[PDB]
Amino acid sequence: MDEDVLPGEVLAIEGIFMACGLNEPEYLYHPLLSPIKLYITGLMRDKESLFEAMLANVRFHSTTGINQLGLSMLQVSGDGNMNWGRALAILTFGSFVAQKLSNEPHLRDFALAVLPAYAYEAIGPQWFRARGGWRGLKAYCTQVLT
Amino acid sequence: ESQEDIIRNIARHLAQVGDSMDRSIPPG
């Protein structure tokens, strides 16, 4: 029973989208995530063209389209595999979606209300916890060359 | 054009990007 924890996980992910996607402050201080957000901001800069091309012919500026992107995150693990690279790809993609909605408040706010939960499920809370959760991801991001 | 096709293709590309970026110890 990780019931006291699920709200905080969704909120931490939303703060990644707020910080990396929208360059704005979040609700609570998450020190472990500072290097993770820097890493994501770097992926977004160095791989912008790749992500923008993923959505090239996708009409995602709608609630149905945002939902489909959340369903896409869930399907990343369709082959039964998860790994840190995929987790970071999910978080980076969510941040890019927020960024691209930054001039459409209602859709931006919708994305921030649903994509964090989709990303939480897509990563896999059990998978993530068994690997040290955010402390694990912070160590991956700091110890390893891109 | 199908929602299912759209989702499958995006997910595949995301998984491929993730797999290429991954720096976890690989399988033998």
Residues of A in contact with B15 (CB under 8 A): 76-79, 81, 86, 89
* Other beta carbons within 10 Å of A17: 25
- Structure determination method: X-ray
Alpha-carbon gap: B8 to the closest alpha carbon of chain A (Å): 7
Query: How many whole angstroms separate alpha carbon A58 and alpha carbon A69?
Result: 10
Q: List the domain boundaries for chain B.
A: 1-28
- Are A112 and A14 spatial neighbours (Cβ–Cβ below 8 Å)? yes
Residue B5 C-alpha, separation from nearest chain A C-alpha, in angstroms? 10
B20 contact A CB<8A: yes
| Domains of chain A, earliest start first | 5-143 (1.10.437.10)
3-state secondary structure chain A: CCCCCHHHHHHHHHHHHHHHHHCCCCCCCCHHHHHHHHHHHHHHHHCHHHHHHHCCCCCCCCHHHHHHHHHHHHHHHHHCCCCHHHHHHHHHHHHHHHHHCCCCHHHHHHHHHHHHHHHHHHHCHHHHHHCCHHHHHHHHHHHCCC
Tell me how far CA of residue B11 lies from CA of A78, A103, B26, in angstroms.
8, 26, 21
| DSSP 8-state assignment for residue B24 | S
Helix, strand or coil, per DSSP, at residue B12: helix
- CB proximity list for A63: less than 8 A, separation 6 or greater: A107, A110
How far is the alpha carbon of B9 from chain A, nearest alpha carbon, in Å?
A: 8
Nearest to A72 by CA among A58, A61, A52, A84: A58
Nearest to B14 among A58, A72, A84 (CB): A72
Å resolution of this model? 1.4
